[PDB]
C-alpha cells in the first residue's frame, strides 16, 4: 500500500495510492511556542500563543526540521499509518535543488525508514492525470506559478518559467481592495475570510475592461457575504478584480509577465516542432487555478498572442486542485512502479545521492 | 522495467494491443484486434520495417470517451515507460476516441470498431 504526499506551500495533500482522492488535505504550517509543535489547522487555532511557519516557499523547502514535522503529522495523525511499513511517492518542484532532493530521501529513509520511496515532478503527475506525455502545465498554487513544458513524458528545464505570484498574493490582494471598497478586516479570522471570499466568489472576466463596466453601471455582478459574525457586505468589482492580476500583475506592483504571457514565454522557448502539441495541451493545474471564466481567458489570451491558425486547447479539469495527487495515485499504483522505487536496499548502498539517477 | 510485456514489444513488424485492465498492462487477443471498448484505455504498438530493414516505432495511447481517469492516466505512463524502455525511439501519440489520427485509423485494415463497456475503474 503505497502513500502519495503532495507538499505545496499552502497545503499538504496525503492519500493512498489508488484512491482516487487525497485523504488527508491540510495548512502546511508548523506551530511552535512563543515562550514541542503543533501542525496544521490546530496550529492555527492556537496562533494566538505560536510562532506560525511555512516550511516551503514558493514550492521548495525552506526549513527541514519543520517539513519533518509536517510528514510526521501526515504519517501518524492525518493518515494513521506506520511509514516504516509503505513506499511512499513525495512530489518536488520541476527545478528543486539539487540539495533538496537528497534531504527528502535522506529524511524519508533515515528519519522515517520508508521501505521505498520517490520523488516526481509535480506539473508532470498533473499532466499524466489528464492522460498526457505531452503538453504544457500551468500550476499556479498558494506560493508560486509555473509553465512547464512536457515533451513525452519529461520536463523540458529549459522552458519552465517560475512566476512568484499565487493563491496568498490574491488572498491580500482581495484583502486590500475591499478595505478600499470601505470595509474592514479586523478579527483574528480576517485572511481565512478572505480567502474564504477569493475562494466562493472571484473569477476570472473574459474582457476585464467590459466587466468594470457592466460592474459600474449595474447592480448584476454584485454578491452578498455573510461574515462569520452575520454581517452581510457586497462584493462587486473585486471579485473579477482579484484574480485579474494573475494576467495583470502590475495590479501588485510586479513588473511581471502575466500568466498566458509567461506560458506563450515557456512555449516560445521550445522546439519549433512540439509547439503546436504545447498550444493544444495547456493544463491548468492547483487551487489558485479553480477561479471560474479562467479557462476562456487563457484560451482567449493564448489565442491573440500565437498565429491565428494555431489550434489553442485549454484544459481545465474540475479536480485539478488535486491533479498533482491523482497523478500520484495512479503512478505509484502501476504494476510497472514497483521497479520504479528507490528500496531501502539501494540507499544504504549509495545513500542520498541515489535520487539524482533514479527520479526523474 | 521487467513488466512481461515490455520483454515481448517491438521485436518484428506488426502492431500489438494492450488494454489498461486496473493499473496493469494486458494484451489484446489478436482476434479482437480493432474491437475498442469506450469505457477503456489502450496501448498501441505499430512497429514498422523501413527498405533499411531498420525497425521503426509508433506508440499510440487511445482514450475511449468513457474510460475512467486511473486508465486513461496508466496509458499515458504506460506509453512513456516503454517509449523509455525501447531507448526513447518510440514516436508518441495521444489517440481520442472520435478524433483518431489517420495513421492509426490505417492500422485496421477492415476498420476499427467502437463498442459500450469495459473493464471496471482501478481506482
Ligand atoms: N475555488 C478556488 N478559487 C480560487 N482559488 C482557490 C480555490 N480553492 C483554493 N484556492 C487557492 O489555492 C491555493 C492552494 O492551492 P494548492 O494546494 O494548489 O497550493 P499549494 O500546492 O499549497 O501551493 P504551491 O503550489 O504554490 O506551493 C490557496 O491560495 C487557495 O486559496
Ligand atoms: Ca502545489
Ligand atoms: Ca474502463
Ligand atoms: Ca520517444
Not at chain 1, 494513521?80 to 530521501?105: I, S
Not at chain 1, 515557456?266 to 492547483?286: A, E, F, P, Q, T
Not at chain 1, 495527487?325 to 536496499?345: H, P, R, V, Y
Request: net charge negative; glycine share 8%; with cysteine.
Amino acid at each position: 500500500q503505497a502513500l502519495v504526499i503532495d507538499n505545496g506551500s499552502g497545503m499538504c495533500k496525503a492519500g493512498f495510492a489508488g484512491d482516487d482522492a487525497p485523504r488527508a488535505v491540510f495548512p502546511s504550517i508548523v506551530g511552535r511556542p512563543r515562550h514541542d509543535s503543533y501542525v496544521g489547522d490546530e496550529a492555527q487555532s492556537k496562533r494566538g500563543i505560536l510562532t506560525l511557519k511555512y516550511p516551503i516557499e514558493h514550492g521548495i523547502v525552506t526549513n527541514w526540521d519543520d517539513m519533518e514535522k509536517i510528514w510526521h503529522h501526515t504519517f501518524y495523525n492525518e493518515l494513521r499509518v506506520a511509514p516504516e511499513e509503505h513506499p511512499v511517492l513525495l512530489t518536488e518542484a520541476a527545478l528543486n535543488p539539487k540539495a533538496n532532493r537528497e534531504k527528502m530521501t535522506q529524511i524519508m529513509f533515515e528519519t522515517f525508514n520508508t521501505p521505498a520511496m520517490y520523488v516526481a515532478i509535480q506539473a508532470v503527475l498533473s499532466l499524466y492525470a489528464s492522460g498526457r506525455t505531452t503538453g504544457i502545465v500551468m500550476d499556479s498554487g498558494d506560493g508560486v506559478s509555473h509553465t512547464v513544458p512536457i515533451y513525452e513524458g519529461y520536463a523540458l528545464p529549459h522552458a519552465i518559467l517560475r512566476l512568484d505570484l499565487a493563491g496568498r498574493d490574491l488572498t491580500d490582494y482581495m484583502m486590500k481592495i475591499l478595505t478600499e471598497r470601505g470595509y474592514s478586516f479586523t478579527t483574528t479570522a480576517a485572511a481565512a475570510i478572505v480567502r474564504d471570499i477569493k475562494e466562493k466568489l472571484a473569477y476570472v472576466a473574459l474582457d476585464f475592461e467590459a466587466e468594470m463596466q457592466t460592474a459600474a453601471s449595474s447592480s448584476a455582478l454584485e454578491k452578498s457575504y455573510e461574515l462569520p459574525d452575520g454581517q452581510v457586505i457586497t462584493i462587486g468589482n473585486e471579485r473579477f478584480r482579484c484574480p485579474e492580476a494573475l494576467f495583470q500583475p502590475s495590479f501588485l506592483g510586479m513588473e511581471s509577465a502575466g500568466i498566458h504571457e509567461t506560458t506563450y514565454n515557456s512555449i516560445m522557448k521550445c522546439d519549433v516542432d512540439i509547439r503546436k502539441d504545447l498550444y493544444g495541451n495547456v493544463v491548468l493545474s492547483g487551487g489558485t487555478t479553480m477561479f471560474p471564466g479562467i479557462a476562456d481567458r487563457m484560451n482567449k489570451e493564448l489565442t491573440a498572442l500565437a498565429p491565428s491558425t494555431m489550434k489553442i486547447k485549454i484544459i481545465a479539469p474540475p479536480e485539478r486542485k488535486y491533479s498533482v495527487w491523482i497523478g500520484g495515485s495512479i503512478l505509484a499504483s502501476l504494476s510497472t512502479f514497483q521497479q520504479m522505487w528507490i528500496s531501502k536496499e539501494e540507499y544504504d548502498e549509495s545513500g542520498p545521492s541515489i535520487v539524482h539517477r533514479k527520479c526523474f | 522495467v521487467e513488466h512481461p510485456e515490455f520483454l515481448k514489444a517491438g521485436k518484428e513488424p506488426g502492431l500489438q494491443i494492450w488494454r489498461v485492465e486496473k493499473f496493469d498492462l494486458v494484451p489484446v487477443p489478436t482476434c479482437l484486434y480493432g474491437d475498442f471498448f469506450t469505457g477503456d484505455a489502450y496501448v498501441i504498438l505499430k512497429t514498422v520495417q523501413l527498405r533499411n530493414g531498420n525497425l521503426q516505432y509508433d506508440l499510440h495511447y487511445w482514450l475511449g470517451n468513457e474510460c475512467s481517469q486511473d486508465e486513461s492516466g496508466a496509458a499515458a505512463i504506460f506509453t512513456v515507460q516503454l517509449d523509455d524502455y525501447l531507448n526513447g525511439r518510440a514516436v508518441q501519440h495521444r489517440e481520442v476516441q472520435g478524433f483518431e489520427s489517420a495513421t492509426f485509423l490505417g492500422y485496421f485494415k477492415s476498420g476499427l470498431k467502437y463498442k459500450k463497456g469495459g473493464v471496471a475503474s482501478g481506482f
